[PDB]
Amino acid sequence: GGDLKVKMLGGEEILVPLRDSMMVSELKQFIAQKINVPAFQQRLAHLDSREVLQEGVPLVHQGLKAGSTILLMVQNSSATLNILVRNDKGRSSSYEVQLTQTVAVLKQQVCQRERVQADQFWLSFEGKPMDDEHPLGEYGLTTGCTVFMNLRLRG
């Protein structure tokens, strides 16, 4: 394998072991445990093609080997974004949030916008329920993603 080179902010280089045929999630987790930044707050890209580093593919046929670098971008201004959250009726409103804050904040926001209680609904994204205590970015959010609001339907 060797040692891959990551170039952060275009003004520093960090070395990382090159486990042949390994995923980008472990790369982001390595950098995360190395510089104490969350994985969802990292964006990795190529040098000169400016193309998106595909996820779920081993960076092998993607054309990567030791001695080649990759650019890294950190995002905690803290930045903001906005998602579409769908009511149980279907009227998905727009909520601007941040990946750093907890899901309880988003739940209270949905409460104040729907005038409904907190214990009576839960959020979901892409076939999995969202935990309250965990951060938002751990669920892979992006602008325009439709987070579902599901009522307890207790009657």
Binding site: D88, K89, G90, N150, R152, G155
Partner: protein
């Protein structure tokens, strides 16, 4: 049919949602159930048990006691409650206890059936629809969520 011709978006595996805008009585027959706190199990026993009685509901909760040990610790809705299986069953099996989407999903996965909850807002217009199971709507156990605190049975019309 118009009921097999429905768009269902998947929320989690075993749970679909939709928002059809129409009136219930146009297709369904609303069998009203008592408001003793067990109207969900009453409306289930109306469609699922031969020769239903006001106390034929208890039997249905029996089935829940299996599914609770089968899917509660693995149900997508149960996460974030802060209650174990025992804290759950101590009150959920207690008489005159409400029942909602969690029990419907656990019973649909337990009984190899398909529970469809038709929630209506306003006097008689459907606001949303939640479906636990993959089965047909004509052959499903159709429930009606009048208000936000009651359940009635929905017999399918010929």
């Amino acid at each position: 049919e118009f009921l097999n011709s429905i768009p269902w978006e998947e929320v989690v595996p075993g749970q679909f949602t939709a928002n059809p805008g129409f009136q219930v009585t146009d297709y369904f027959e609303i069998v009203r159930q008592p408001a003793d706190g067990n109207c969900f199990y009453h409306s289930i026993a109306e469609l699922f048990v031969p020769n239903k009685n006001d106390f034929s509901f208890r039997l249905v909760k029996q089935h829940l006691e299996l599914a609770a040990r089968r899917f509660f610790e693995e149900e997508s809705e149960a996460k974030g409650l802060g209650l174990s299986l025992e804290k759950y069953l101590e009150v959920a099996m207690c008489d005159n206890e409400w029942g909602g989407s969690l029990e419907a999903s656990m019973l649909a996965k337990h009984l190899d059936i398909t529970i469809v909850i038709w929630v209506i807002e306003g006097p008689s217009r459907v606001a949303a629809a939640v479906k636990f199971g993959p089965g047909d709507v004509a052959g499903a156990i159709n429930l009606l969520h009048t208000g936000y605190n009651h359940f009635d049975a929905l017999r399918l019309l010929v």
